[PDB]
């Protein structure tokens, strides 16, 4: 099948088509490069790829020339080296003399490859050019001068970002890629361009001057800023988090994390639950030792076992604290298990687990021949996934269309009205668009998880379930496709539902005194009108925003990087956080306070170490013990659908995404809220 071509000596079963680049990179040999990028697109500019084929009269572009049989490629051969010398002599013929003040200058690819190749001495004798600076955003400073006409950034920008403000300008000498006009570039993945810059041309402003790469430790984990569950390599230093970088994974980020997550770290540096703060006789909180507050909550929670207690789970909160806290509620048989976002459960959808899962992987989206979405735009919940969409749109070629709003997505989508008509016209299959749904195989059916609420969103639930079942009726589906899926935006509900605590319905907000706060970041779903009498309400967030002041006898706790507590991706992927800089002061591991309160409560938890609570997760979850295991038995729509139709709810108007536009996207969780870069950035997008 595969064509044969020789790396220097070894014969290689190289793929049909494909560049010389991938050929040499199969044996592991690695061609020098700049403008090319591994998941971008080939461009002939900046020919660092030059190599001579064994019979070549003159050197070829290894990053571009397709392989073909009978060729042989001496990468180590002298002429290729003369070529690379030809490149490097020129790139440096006019480069600025500012390695030291370069934020990329401690690690620029131009440097490493300046070491690998090019004569040690230079022969400049005149006057180098230097362009003026060209601002394109508050959070992405651009020194220029430094950019090497390599065009990797426009091919990123014009494409996956979808915005085209960036681009080439002029020809001959003093040509420049500086974007036309004063106007700032903006995108929901604006920050990723920083990574993609080979040099210091695109240094981030917030991180500028702050640090040097070699000094930094690179503690790894995953962010919970998105429900996307993107993996991360974190450059901390000296017990301080210097910067965040994505950790690549094809199933998820594919090395392009959210720009919002990317500058999230700064918010950890703002105000923090540093010390315990018990209200006094004046009703004012004061700094307090743990023995005080914890003996006090130990004095409250022995009083109201079972009923008249509840627990406000947060959106970012670790599953373990939920485990220990529900176990606390087990010992007292306190069934209450409320959680931020409610999730409808006709026939109780918590049990099947598959119900709320995006049953198709983001990796699995590319094979779909047709895709549909309902409600909230993917980008304001999963910008990464939006990029996956536009990428498929640039590649795989398939229809997508919005429902309930025409929100400004980068890619073309058919306009559609609103739910009550569309859902039924499609469920009937009468709708021509639904006729297109029958027309195409490998269906996908997306729902904005924000629409799961929608007061009577259960209607949209039964409707969309009927739709996916109907498209199964259209057949042509493999049937294992698991067409039914949704995009969660929350980092915590998915695991709590893997544990199936409760739908999370807030209708419970009735009588219970002494509800406990886990995060409690929103002022919306819960407030102190629930009990007219006592306002006594325990708290364990980390930033003081919203939830903390309302609460009394405050109990400070850890941020996510600090704890090793786990988090579940919406695809059902499990992935634990690892420790980084550790909590700033009196903050500690989150669930540990719970095990302490329970230990004082006369109902001590049998497990001790976090590894042992993980041991408990096997005897209950049991999926939290296993990490990369997205797969399972999958319960299939047969048993699923049957209780869905034994209810039915009225459809309604209107159907609008929570996030609307870019300007509203900068303030969600307590870190995104408190982050200063977010305030500067939102004021930027305003005026």
């Amino acid at each position: 099948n595969l064509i044969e071509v020789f790396v220097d000596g070894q014969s290689v079963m190289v793929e049909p088509g494909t560049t010389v680049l991938q050929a040499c990179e199969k044996v592991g040999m690695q061609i020098p490069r700049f403008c090319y990028h591994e998941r971008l697109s080939v461009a002939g500019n900046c020919r660092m790829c030059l190599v001579e084929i064994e019979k070549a009269p003159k050197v070829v572009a290894a990053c571009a020339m397709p392989v073909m049989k009978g060729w042989n490629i001496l990468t180590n051969s002298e002429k290729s080296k003369k070529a690379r010398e030809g490149v490097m002599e020129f790139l440096l013929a006019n480069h600025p003399l500012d390695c030291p003040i370069c934020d990329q200058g401690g690690e620029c690819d131009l440097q490493d490859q300046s070491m690998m190749f090019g004569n040690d001495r230079s022969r400049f004798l005149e006057g180098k050019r230097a362009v003026e600076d060209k601002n394109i955003g508050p959070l992405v400073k651009t020194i220029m001068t430094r950019c090497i006409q390599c065009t990797r950034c426009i091919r990123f920008a014009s494409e996956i970002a979808g915005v085209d403000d960036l681009g080439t300008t002029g020809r001959g000498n003093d040509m420049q890629v500086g974007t036309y006009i004063e106007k700032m570039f903006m995108s929901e993945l604006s920050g990723n361009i920083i990574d993609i810059c080979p040099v210091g041309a695109l240094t981030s402003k917030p991180y500028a001057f702050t640090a040097r790469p070699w000094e930094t430790r690179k503690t790894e984990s995953i962010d919970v800023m998105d429900a996307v569950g993107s993996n991360i390599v974190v450059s901390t230093r000296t017990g301080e988090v210097m910067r965040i970088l994505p950790r690549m994974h094809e199933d998820i980020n594919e090395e392009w994390i959210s720009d919002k997550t990317r500058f999230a770290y700064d918010g950890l540096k703002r105000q923090r639950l540093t010390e315990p703060m018990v209200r006094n006789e004046k009703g004012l909180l004061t700094y307090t030792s743990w023995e005080d507050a914890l003996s006090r909550v130990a004095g409250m929670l022995q009083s109201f076992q079972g009923k008249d207690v509840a627990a406000i789970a947060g959106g970012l909160v670790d599953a373990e604290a939920l485990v220990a806290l529900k176990d606390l509620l087990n010992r007292v048989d306190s069934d209450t298990l409320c959680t931020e976002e409610v999730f409808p459960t006709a026939g109780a959808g918590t049990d099947l687990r598959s119900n709320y899962l995006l049953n198709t992987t983001i990796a699995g989206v590319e094979e779909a021949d047709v895709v549909l979405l309902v409600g909230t735009n993917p980008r304001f919940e999963a910008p990464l996934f939006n990029a996956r969409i536009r990428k498929s749109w640039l590649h795989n070629d398939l229809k997508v269309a919005l429902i309930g709003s025409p929100v400004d997505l980068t890619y073309t989508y058919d306009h559609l009205g609103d739910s009550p008509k569309i859902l039924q016209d499609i469920a009937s299959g009468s709708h021509p668009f639904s006729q297109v749904l029958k027309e195409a195989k490998k269906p996908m059916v997306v729902l904005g998880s924000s629409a799961l609420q929608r007061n009577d969103g259960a209607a949209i639930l039964a409707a969309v379930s009927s739709i996916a079942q109907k498209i199964r009726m259209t057949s042509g589906v493999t049937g294992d496709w698991k067409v039914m899926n949704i995009l969660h935006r929350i980092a915590s509900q998915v695991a709590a539902l893997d544990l199936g605590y409760k739908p999370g319905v807030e209708a419970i907000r009735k009588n219970p005194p002494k509800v406990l706060f886990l995060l409690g970041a929103d002022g919306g779903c819960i407030t102190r009108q629930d009990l007219p009498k006592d306002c006594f309400i325990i708290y364990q967030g980390h930033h003081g925003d919203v939830g903390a002041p309302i609460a009394d006898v405050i109990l400070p706790g850890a941020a996510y990087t600090e704890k090793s507590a786990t988090y579940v991706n919406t695809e059902g992927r499990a992935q634990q956080t690892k420790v980084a800089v550790t909590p700033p002061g009196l903050a500690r591991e989150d669930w540990k306070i719970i095990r302490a309160l329970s230990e004082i409560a006369g109902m001590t938890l049998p497990y001790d170490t976090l590894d042992q609570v993980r041991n408990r997760l096997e005897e209950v979850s049991p999926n939290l013990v296993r990490y990369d295991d997205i797969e399972g038995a999958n319960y299939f729509q047969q048993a699923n659908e049957l209780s869905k139709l034994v209810n039915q709810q009225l459809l309604a108007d209107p159907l609008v995404p929570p996030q609307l536009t870019i300007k509203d996207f900068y303030m969600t969780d307590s870190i995104s809220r408190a982050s200063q870069t977010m305030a500067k950035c939102v004021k930027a997008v305003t005026e």
Binding site: V27, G28, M29, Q30, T75, D112, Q113, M116, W214, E215
Partner: protein, 208 residues
């Protein structure tokens, strides 16, 4: 190719090579590789069970009187199960020759002691005992060199911290020096200066 480059001495490489096959003949039972670089530096394997019988032979003339154990240089590589890599540098004075003849051992393998054979290794002994734990055949005393008295560690194991776990200081009411847990200030701020992008294609272990 010259003003900076150091000239390659092919002649000595030829002679050392030929002698290398010569020795390859002489002790097939333990001798393995006959490495011969352009540094004019020959090298040879030995199985650890073959430590003494080879080495004694070395001291005695064939065409090289491997007199004077100049060194028992030692290296630990945790990856290999035979993590230890004891090396016998040697020098046949009559022939002005130099050679490097090494081995390997596990943590509980009593590798043979050339103490009877060279006696120079009465301490190459106890250092490489102490720093490591490379137990030795039969030595008059395995008491530690260098490391203190009650000291438990084995630094140069390429294991446990460069500061070690131990940091002693005089203490008041006990009226005496006492070992204590480390508590380094500032900490060895290690720099990872490793370079992605190989500079030496000629080497490069295959991905396989």
């Amino acid at each position: 190719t010259r003003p900076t480059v150091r000239p390659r001495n092919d002649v000595a490489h030829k002679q050392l090579s030929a002698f290398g096959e010569y020795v390859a003949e002489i002790l097939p039972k333990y001798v393995q590789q006959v490495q011969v670089s352009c540094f004019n530096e020959l090298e040879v394997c030995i199985h650890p069970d073959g430590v003494i019988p080879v080495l004694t032979f070395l001291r005695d003339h064939t065409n090289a009187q491997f007199k004077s154990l100049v060194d028992l240089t030692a290296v630990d590589v945790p990856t290999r199960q035979n993590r230890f890599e004891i090396v016998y540098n040697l020098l046949s004075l009559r022939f002005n020759s130099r050679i490097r003849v090494k081995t390997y051992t596990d943590e509980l393998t009593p590798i043979e002691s050339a103490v009877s054979v060279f006696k120079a290794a009465n301490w190459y002994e106890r250092e490489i005992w102490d720093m490591f734990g490379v137990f030795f055949a039969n030595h008059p005393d395995l008491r530690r060199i260098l490391t203190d008295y009650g000291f438990e560690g084995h630094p140069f194991r390429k294991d446990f911290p460069l500061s070690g776990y131990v940091e002693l200081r005089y203490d008041d009411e006990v009226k005496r020096v006492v070992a204590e847990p480390v508590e380094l200030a500032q900490e060895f701020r290690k720099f990872d200066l490793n370079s992605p992008w190989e500079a030496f294609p000629v080497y490069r272990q295959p991905p396989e």
